[PDB]
Amino acid sequence: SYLWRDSEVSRSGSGDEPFGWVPEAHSVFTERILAEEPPYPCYFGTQGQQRGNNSFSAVDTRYPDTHGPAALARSLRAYRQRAWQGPKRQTLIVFVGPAVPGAELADDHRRFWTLLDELRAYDTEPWPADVPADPSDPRWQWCFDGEPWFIFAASPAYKDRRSRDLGPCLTLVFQVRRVFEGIGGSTVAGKAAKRRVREGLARYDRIGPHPTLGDGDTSTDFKWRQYTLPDDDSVAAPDACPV
């Protein structure tokens, strides 16, 4: 395991034990995404939360042999199975802790890429034949358990891009392709989804949508850039993926 529904996340926690800080990270996350004024910009995530469609896990950096990447690989395999049954719009939120006071965005980003690397070692499935393995390829995406994931990193060090601050921990948000059924970027519903989320971003964030966010007319190349947005509108070089 370590794959939890909301009800299964423990009620309170003892900071010194493995995952003893998770109750607090979970409360702050749920407070952020359910906040009513201004609303959390992604109404899909809010609704996911309200319907009980979000799952959770964690990594405890102090207990790597038992509550680390290997256990997360097992939890992701279980999540992948859950995500292809029942409702289409599910998300997995993974808290990485304990929180490190003072951490900068660069540091959180470094930790994010290290974890993705480490998870690779615990994959039981080969890299998908239809996604290139070179991360400098325009079509590269992170893959695990035989398919590509949609993934991004949230951090308290986001000051203007407040939408990506989900509480005190480095937080990973994972989804399978299924969540986008009917809302592909090129469709009328997909465009409506973009308009609606971006209106929410305008009122919640102090900086506008990042330039690497697609208009949805073409497949977006160098998706890696979207996993770890900067807090400004700088655009990284397509070929500088850190994995």
Closest approach of Cβ 196 to ligand HEM, in Å?
8
What are φ and ψ of residue 199, in 5° steps?
Answer: -65, -40
Nearest to 151 by CA among 98, 233, 81, 79: 79
Residues 6+ apart with CB under 8 A from 63: 18
Distance between CA 222 and CA 220 in Å, rounded?
A: 7
Which region among 43-51, 73-81, 99-107, 138-146 touches ligand HEM (by CB under 6 A)?
43-51
Taking CB under 6 A as the criterion, which residues in 96-115 touch ligand HEM?
none
**Structural tokens at position 79:** 């999540």
Site string for ligand HEM, 158-197 (x = CB under 6 A): -----xx--------x-----x---x---------xx--x
Closest approach of Cβ 100 to ligand HEM, in Å?
21
For ligand HEM, which is the closer residue by CB, 18 or 214? 214
Write b or e for each residue in 15-41: b if 16 or more Cβ atoms lie within 10 A of its Cβ, otherwise e: eeebbbbbbbbbebbbebbeeeeeebb
Which region among 18-26, 38-46, 124-132, 135-143 touches ligand HEM (by CB under 6 A)?
38-46
- List residues binding ligand HEM (CB under 6 A): 33, 42, 44-45, 48, 54, 89, 91, 93, 152, 163-164, 173, 179, 183, 193-194, 197-198, 213, 226, 229
